Amino acid sequence: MNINATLIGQSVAFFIFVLFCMKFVWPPVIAALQERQKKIADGLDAANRAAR
Amino acid sequence: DLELAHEKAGQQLREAKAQAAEIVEQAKKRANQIVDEARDQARTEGERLKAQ
């Protein structure tokens, strides 16, 4: 169908969005998952420390 | 459970030191009995020997 510069506006918005989400969407959630990981791991190690 | 186990262990750990020390307390009473009966035995050998 018809070829337009429409791809530019969407691509430019996407490049800026990809750089933004890496700093404001992934870090808070991955940190909140790493905390639970650490809490489950150290919580299971706490039982091994008590048993020793 | 780690803190509760540390408390359970803390009580069993110290109670065994007091109970083990009581074996030494029986040994001190036994040592006194050995020495007191040795003094009576020595007195007995002294009065038995001088009679001859």
Side-chain angles (χ1 to χ4, degrees):
Chain A
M1 292 182 292
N2 191 15
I3 307 302
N4 282 83
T6 306
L7 81 171
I8 308 178
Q10 183 168 6
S11 303
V12 169
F14 176 75
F15 292 139
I16 292 164
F17 194 108
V18 165
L19 291 169
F20 179 86
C21 64
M22 170 177 59
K23 298 297 187 178
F24 302 100
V25 179
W26 263 76
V29 185
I30 197 170
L33 290 168
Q34 282 183 343
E35 292 162 0
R36 278 170 281 181
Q37 168 56 25
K38 288 170 59 66
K39 288 286 182 178
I40 291 292
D42 195 24
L44 288 167
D45 288 344
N48 293 334
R49 288 191 297 257
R52 282 165 60 194
Chain B
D1 286 344
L2 171 62
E3 181 75 331
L4 296 170
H6 191 278
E7 178 58 29
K8 284 176 181 181
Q11 294 295 341
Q12 290 183 359
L13 181 294
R14 75 187 73 178
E15 284 296 310
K17 307 299 161 287
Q19 186 269 352
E22 286 181 6
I23 300 177
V24 194
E25 195 63 30
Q26 308 327 297
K28 287 177 298 177
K29 287 202 299 275
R30 174 64 190 289
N32 184 79
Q33 176 266 347
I34 289 162
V35 177
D36 284 347
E37 291 194 40
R39 282 285 185 190
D40 192 28
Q41 193 74 48
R43 181 197 65 76
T44 304
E45 300 322 318
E47 65 92 0
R48 184 184 63 70
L49 186 292
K50 78 190 303 293
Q52 183 282 323

